[PDB]
């Protein structure tokens, strides 16, 4: 299977630098053009930078030129995007992809350029067909991910988009509906991972 695995996102101060990497497996990167494409939250796709096959000539959107540098390491089969002088306007999910009609994409990594500090979530039970959930409150930056029972419970989960609170901190809920017959036998645990602060929270949600 052809795969692109990106790494190197996260929170950066205005003016700082980040290096994105796009590790490619299942093909030789030398033979393929690589491209970086970004998505501001809730917005369209915007092309950032391209690197050609073989020769490796570079092209850049006018709004990142002289600040970003795309490159590729063949002996690592990885492409990169060095980003200098990041500004709030550079906040986005960044994708790497191959070819001009981009057939394979990275999973995407979010770049947040801000001077607010990182803060892990507080997780609260939403205790109980029965509904139950986990309130994932007061975290920064995005993202967080929520699973249930270590991913063994997927049917009927609704993890909601975060809302930005007036504090500047994000909050969200993730809820699941289950048979009420299981409220006494089956235990339900939400698994909340906030990689920007290197924090995972596991919370058993019990009926009250």
């Amino acid at each position: 299977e052809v795969q692109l695995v990106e790494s190197g996102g996260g929170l950066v101060q205005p003016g700082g630098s980040l290096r994105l990497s796009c590790a490619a497996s299942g093909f030789t990167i030398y033979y393929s053009s690589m491209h970086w494409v970004r998505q501001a939250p809730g917005k369209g796709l915007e092309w950032v930078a391209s690197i050609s096959s073989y020769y490796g000539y570079t092209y850049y959107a006018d709004s990142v030129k002289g600040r970003f540098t795309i490159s590729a390491d063949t002996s690592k089969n990885t492409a990169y995007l060095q980003m200098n002088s990041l500004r709030a306007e550079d906040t986005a999910v960044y994708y790497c992809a191959r070819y001009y009609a981009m057939d394979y994409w990275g999973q995407g990594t979010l770049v947040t350029v801000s001077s607010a500090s990182t803060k892990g979530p507080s997780v609260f039970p939403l205790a109980p067909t029965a509904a139950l959930g986990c309130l994932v409150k007061d975290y920064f930056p995005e993202p967080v991910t929520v699973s249930w029972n270590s991913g063994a419970l997927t049917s009927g989960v609704h993890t909601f988009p975060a809302v930005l609170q007036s504090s500047g901190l994000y909050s969200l809920s993730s809820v699941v509906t289950v048979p009420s017959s299981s409220l006494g036998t089956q235990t339900y645990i939400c698994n909340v991972n906030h990689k920007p602060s290197n924090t995972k929270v596991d919370k058993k949600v019990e009926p009250k």
């Binding site: 030789t28 030398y30 073989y54 063949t74 002996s75």
Partner: protein, 213 residues
Amino acid sequence: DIQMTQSPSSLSASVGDRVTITCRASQSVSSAVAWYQQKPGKAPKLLIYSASSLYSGVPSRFSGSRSGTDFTLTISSLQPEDFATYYCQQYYGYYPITFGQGTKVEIKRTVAAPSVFIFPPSDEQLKSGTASVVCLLNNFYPREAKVSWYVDNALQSGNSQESVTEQDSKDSTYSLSSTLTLSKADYEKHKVYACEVTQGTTSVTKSFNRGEC
């Protein structure tokens, strides 16, 4: 026009030897040079691209390098599966692609004199008016040898063809056949048929007399 000039045309090496094959471009091709291995009866196999990049799966004993227009393929320690033909290739672009003429990497072994046999035409063949006399040089080394046909001590010109086997995988020898083609009428009017094999300072002639068994 871009020429990839490959040296040497062939070489003899032993397992464990360090083998260097040079290719010289007639002008600059940047690093757009590839190296291939080919074995008889099979399609070529890419080993190096961009003149120094080891293609995926290729054992690390192969290495490519560039100095200006000079491109060299190095095998640090020759393995038994490495005996083959190698080709350099430029793909820089205005021909956009030009292959070197190739370097065959042959097994070294001690000199070995051929067993030489001469085969008169079968009576089955003669009935239809043509006579093929076949000379066989069996399991010799090195490959280079000169074969000459003599009919009643007269050198034959232009009526014979030769063919050589690939090096034997077991004793590293070569074998060679030469066929002399005559009409049946010409065949019947001569008595002595001889095949002469020369290598170095030795000539060995095998002969028969038409009619004597």
